[PDB]
Amino acid sequence: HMRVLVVPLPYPTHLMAMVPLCWALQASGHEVLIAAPPELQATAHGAGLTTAGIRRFPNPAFGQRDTEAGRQLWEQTASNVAQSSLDQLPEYLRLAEAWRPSVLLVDVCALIGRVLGGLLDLPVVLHRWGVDPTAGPFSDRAHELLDPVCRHHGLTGLPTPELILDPCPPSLQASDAPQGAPVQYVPYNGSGAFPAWGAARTSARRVCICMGRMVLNATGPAPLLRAVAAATELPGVEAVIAVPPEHRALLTDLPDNARIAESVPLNLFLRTCELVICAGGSGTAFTATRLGIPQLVLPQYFDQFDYARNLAAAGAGICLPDEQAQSDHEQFTDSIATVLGDTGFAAAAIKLSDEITAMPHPAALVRTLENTA
Amino acid sequence: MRVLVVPLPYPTHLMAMVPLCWALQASGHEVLIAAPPELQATAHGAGLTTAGIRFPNPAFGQRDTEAGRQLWEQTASNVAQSSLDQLPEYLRLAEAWRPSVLLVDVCALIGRVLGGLLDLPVVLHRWGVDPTAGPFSDRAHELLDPVCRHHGLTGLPTPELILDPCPPSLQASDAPQGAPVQYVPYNGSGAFPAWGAARTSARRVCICMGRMVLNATGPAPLLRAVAAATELPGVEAVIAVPPEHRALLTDLPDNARIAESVPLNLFLRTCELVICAGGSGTAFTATRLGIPQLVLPQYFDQFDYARNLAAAGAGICLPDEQAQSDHEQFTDSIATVLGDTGFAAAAIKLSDEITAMPHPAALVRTLEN
Ligand SMILES: CC[C@H]1CCC[C@H](O)[C@@H](C)C(=O)C2=C[C@@H]3[C@@H](C=C[C@@H]4C[C@@H](O)C[C@@H]34)[C@@H]2CC(=O)O1
Ligand SMILES: OC[C@H]1O[C@@H](O)[C@H](O)[C@@H](O)[C@@H]1O
Numbered sequence: 001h002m003r004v005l006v007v008p009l010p011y012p013t014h015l016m017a018m019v020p021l022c023w024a025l026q027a028s029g030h031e032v033l034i035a036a037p038p039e040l041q042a043t044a045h046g047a048g049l050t051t052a053g054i055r056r057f058p059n060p061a062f063g064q065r066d067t068e069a070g071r072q073l074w075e076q077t078a079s080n081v082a083q084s085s086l087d088q089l090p091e092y093l094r095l096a097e098a099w100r101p102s103v104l105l106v107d108v109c110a111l112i113g114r115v116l117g118g119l120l121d122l123p124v125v126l127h128r129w130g131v132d133p134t135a136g137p138f139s140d141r142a143h144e145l146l147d148p149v150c151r152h153h154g155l156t157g158l159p160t161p162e163l164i165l166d167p168c169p170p171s172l173q174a175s176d177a178p179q180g181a182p183v184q185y186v187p188y189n190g191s192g193a194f195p196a197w198g199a200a201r202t203s204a205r206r207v208c209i210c211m212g213r214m215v216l217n218a219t220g221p222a223p224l225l226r227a228v229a230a231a232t233e234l235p236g237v238e239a240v241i242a243v244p245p246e247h248r249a250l251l252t253d254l255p256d257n258a259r260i261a262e263s264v265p266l267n268l269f270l271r272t273c274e275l276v277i278c279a280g281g282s283g284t285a286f287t288a289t290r291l292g293i294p295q296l297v298l299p300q301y302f303d304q305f306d307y308a309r310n311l312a313a314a315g316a317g318i319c320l321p322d323e324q325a326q327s328d329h330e331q332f333t334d335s336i337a338t339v340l341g342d343t344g345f346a347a348a349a350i351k352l353s354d355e356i357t358a359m360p361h362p363a364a365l366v367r368t369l370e371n372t373a
Numbered sequence: 374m375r376v377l378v379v380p381l382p383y384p385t386h387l388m389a390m391v392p393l394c395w396a397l398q399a400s401g402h403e404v405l406i407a408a409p410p411e412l413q414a415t416a417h418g419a420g421l422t423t424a425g426i427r428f429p430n431p432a433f434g435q436r437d438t439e440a441g442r443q444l445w446e447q448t449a450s451n452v453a454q455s456s457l458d459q460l461p462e463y464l465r466l467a468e469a470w471r472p473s474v475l476l477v478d479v480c481a482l483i484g485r486v487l488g489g490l491l492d493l494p495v496v497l498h499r500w501g502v503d504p505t506a507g508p509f510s511d512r513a514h515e516l517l518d519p520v521c522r523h524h525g526l527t528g529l530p531t532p533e534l535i536l537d538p539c540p541p542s543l544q545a546s547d548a549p550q551g552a553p554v555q556y557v558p559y560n561g562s563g564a565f566p567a568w569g570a571a572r573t574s575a576r577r578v579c580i581c582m583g584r585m586v587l588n589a590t591g592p593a594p595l596l597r598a599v600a601a602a603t604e605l606p607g608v609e610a611v612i613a614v615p616p617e618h619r620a621l622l623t624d625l626p627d628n629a630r631i632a633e634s635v636p637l638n639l640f641l642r643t644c645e646l647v648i649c650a651g652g653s654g655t656a657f658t659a660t661r662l663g664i665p666q667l668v669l670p671q672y673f674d675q676f677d678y679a680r681n682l683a684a685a686g687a688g689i690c691l692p693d694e695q696a697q698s699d700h701e702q703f704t705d706s707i708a709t710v711l712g713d714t715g716f717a718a719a720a721i722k723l724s725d726e727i728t729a730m731p732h733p734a735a736l737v738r739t740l741e742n
């Protein structure tokens with residue numbers, strides 16, 4: 001009987017990536033508690049989970065970690081996360097002392113989970129949400145800043161985790177990421193209602209455009225407007241537009257070949273679509289991949305450029321890699337056409353789907369965790 | 374598998390099925406809840422996806438009596454009339470989504486009709502104590518065999534499997550044998566309270582009545598439970614009720630805690646008694662956590678659950694209006710439990726019955742086969 005304390009980064013999307021494992025834990029009779037800043041409360045509660053309370057784009061240099069610009073972005077991200085970890089450390093120590101977890105399930109970027117495991121001598125299981133480009137600059141800066149802290153408390157430095165779980169198709173994972181144990185991606189894109197039109201395809205070429213809140217909060221409307229314009233202008237297309245409610249206002253004068261999806265989890269209808277246009281957020285992208293649906297990716301930040309490049313190398317989609325490509329309406333339209341006219345992209349996407357389904361499901365991982373706790 | 378889930382339109386019946394629905398999804402199967410408006414917020418609050426669909430009375434515990442037989446017959450009549458009314462809506466759903474298996478609440482007869490009409494296997498799911506043998510079942514056949522026979526069946530079909538989370542010690546003696554599944558608490562989402570971690574030097578007594586019960590009974594079982602609990606020396610009452618029932622708590626002692634929208638399981642291990650109406654997520658969470666109960670049954674299965682719990686030595690029943698309205702019987706029952714560690718001993722015995730059962734993840738294999 002484990003008591004698993006879950007330590008995500010405080011973005012809704014990173015928690016979602018861990019929800020099927022949390023359900024697998026609870027379905028197998030273990031107890032799960034999510035350490036959640038205000039920003040995560042609603043996401044955790046919405047997955048049926050319980051919480052303990054805590055409290056310029058696109059930018060290709062994120063995918064250029066061999067350059068000084070890219071090293072800086074990742075070093076700054078580690079410095080931000082490390083400072084947060086020192087800030088919140090007392091609250092997380094009080095929580096662990098109160099709840100007495102036997103294992104920490106920790107998002108790969110949530111460095112506080114690693115500090116907490118060292119200081120409390122608890123097994124840490126890191127969880128990737130997807131492509132992990134934290135080797136090199138992020139990881140070196142996290143050690144730079146957190147090894148002294150861990151040494152003051154008697155340890156050699158920031159500890160190496162007991163295990164890293166990895167749902168990324170191996171043929172897409174970053175070459176420098178440490179080996180992780182496979183865990184099969186299970187779509188979880190929130191709750192909601194099966195729409196009537198989600199049951200069958202029509203004669204039109206159905207293209208979903210899905211961009212999430214954190215991406216659009218960062219980027220502003222541009223990638224959404226560029227996608228809606230490219231998709232709706234192409235002969236034959238029906239666009240299904242899936243964006244968060246407050247962003248729906250950005251879509252004035254919408255084309256008659258456009259439906260605005262009403263907070264509907266992608267996996268309820270994505271089997272009826274021939275193409276997904278997205279930013280390379282894992283929930284969207286791995287659901288499409290699992291379902292053998294090719295993607296046109298407009299990467300923006302963090303790991304998105306690596307996902308987009310590697311998906312395109314796999315033949316399973318097209319990448320528009322920077323702002324001159326994403327803002328090239330002709331190239332954008334021709335890329336949608338290219339995918340709708342060549343079944344080889346869907347076929348390459350099913351090859352990746354097979355990499356996913358070769359992995360053990362979250363339910364099968366519960367055993368591994370039992371052995372590590 | 375593609376599992377379409379057909380609960381009765383009550384939040385608590387769907388909650389009893391949530392951990393299995395999660396176990397199904399964690400093991401790579403697909404799950405959809407057929408949800409009327411009354412179920413939508415519960416389903417989506419468990420992270421699940423939906424297809425939208427458009428007291429006390431001790432006779433419920435006495436199916437040998439004229440009244441007891443008539444209550445359970447009338448309940449089957451109600452459900453059978455509603456299943457016929459809605460049958461064309463569910464048939465359109467099954468055509469749109471194409472399930473391979475129906476996971477159906479024991480009482481949601483539409484699921485059995487639908488399984489028969491579509492030649493799909495039906496896995497019934499008990500939520501706890503199951504008193505549907507006799508009156509309910511006989512009446513369901515009397516009313517639903519005809520539509521089934523019109524479709525060429527022999528009658529309302531026997532289901533493929535009946536999942537049962539009730540510890541056998543507490544189950545009704547006439548419930549056909551089911552396949553045991555470990556009760557996993559699911560009381561909704563919420564926040565771990567500061568004080569839920571540590572025991573106190575006070576005697577911590579949780580009262581948890583619940584929206585559905587209190588909407589049916591009005592305030593009396595809640596306020597009679599608070600009056601009994603707060604009278605006894607050294608007691609700390611922890612009162613768990615829906616947001617809307619918070620305003621009924623007009624005068625509490627200083628040390629009492631109102632736990633609004635806090636799932637019981639986050640703190641119950643620090644309590645020595647739960648006072649409740651029975652059956653339910655509350656009672657099985659108490660029993661799973663080894664906590665004795667004082668049960669004031671109101672309707673349906675609650676009388677059986679209260680009697681069997683008392684028989685097993687893990688609680689006390691206040692069986693009817695005469696007992697529940699008697700503050701001396703009510704206070705003396707609390708004091709009895711607080712004064713005898715044999716109740717907690719018996720409760721722990723049942724907890725172990727529960728935890729010896731296969732968990733919902735282990736049952737996923739059985740459903741596949
Ligand atoms: C499915 C639609 C409804 C139609 C309404 C009928 C009655 O109002 C309701 C009190 C009832 O009989 C029922 C309430 C439920 C139903 C059966 C068993 C439940 C055990 C308890 O937790 C509550 C019980 C029953 C029939 C019903 O729901 O019929
Ligand atoms: O099985 C013994 C008793 O169990 C109860 O559930 C029934 O309502 C009674 O009629 C019966 O005598």
Ligand SMILES: [Mg+2]
Pocket residue numbers: 170173174175
């Ligand atoms: Mg590799």
